[PDB]
Write a protein that binds this ligand. Sequence first.
Ligand code: HEM
Ligand SMILES: Nc1ccnc2ccccc12
Length: 289
Amino acid sequence: LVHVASVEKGRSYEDFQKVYNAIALKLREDDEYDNYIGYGPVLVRLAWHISGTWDKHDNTGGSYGGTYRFKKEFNDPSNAGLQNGFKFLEPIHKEFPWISSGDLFSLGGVTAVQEMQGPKIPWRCGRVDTPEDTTPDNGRLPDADKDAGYVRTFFQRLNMNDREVVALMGAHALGKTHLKNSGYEGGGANNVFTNEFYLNLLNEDWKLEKNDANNEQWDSKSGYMMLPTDYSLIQDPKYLSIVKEYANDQDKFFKDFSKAFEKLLENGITFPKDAPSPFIFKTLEEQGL
Ligand code: HEM
Ligand SMILES: Nc1ccnc2ccccc12
């Protein structure tokens, strides 16, 4: 199964920076969402979940087809709460009806990471909407109540190795869990992209507790939390080495996250030899906007 990137007809970097800017300006404007976290974190989660359905074995799922717009995927229990991201992006899609759904969902994640002071993430256009029958079945996204071996095996399906997995997980610096979406309780409000996930893992005094949904999670006296799968990164000695690396080198973390996240967002897509190079969008701040 081959999905060839096809540039939206006549579009170039200027067109996609306008979309980026629209997203970024709305991220600034809609600041109250989720007790003033804003929409940045849920857009990152959205970009991940629309990509994380990919299966390297048969090239089903992935970001290319924009299949999250279909009920079966929109209603995946693993996607609970992402409707807020979809609703945020609707007026963007209305203004720029030419951009494909996959392009919009993935670009929203890139925009969010960058506007939250994250690394620059190169981004390629050309995802094409595919029909409803291409929507992957539920159950391809990962469970949060398992161990390092599960995480490692899970991510093999997405062609991610240990460093890619650990880097990608650093997005859990952002936002929080919501009991009504996932059964995990969190109390953070972070919407600045940093390596603090790794620092918190290593520095806090974690206690294994049960939350109000009767699920186990790791909690600290300071008020922080980790999912079982998060905590597994310090239980497994190979992941632990990488955690320590990123805790001690912000730039390395940014660089490896950027690479892994672009890869995640591009899995499944064949880019023609003469496709445009990846775009690196300027932030609002870099543009003086
Ligand atoms: C083993 C893999 C992972 C598991 C089990 C997992 C699980 C979770 C869960 C349970 C939530 C809470 C959802 C809610 O209650 O609203 C969450 C949120 C989040 N996840 Fe992950 N995740 C994984 C990997 C990732 C990856 C790879 C990224 C992106 C690079 C990502 C980005 C996020 C973000 C940004 C949020 C916060 C969303 C918000 O504040 O609304 N996660 N994840
Ligand atoms: N903010 C967070 C801290 C630790 N784990 C998380 C897991 C999912 C979302 C957010 C977090």
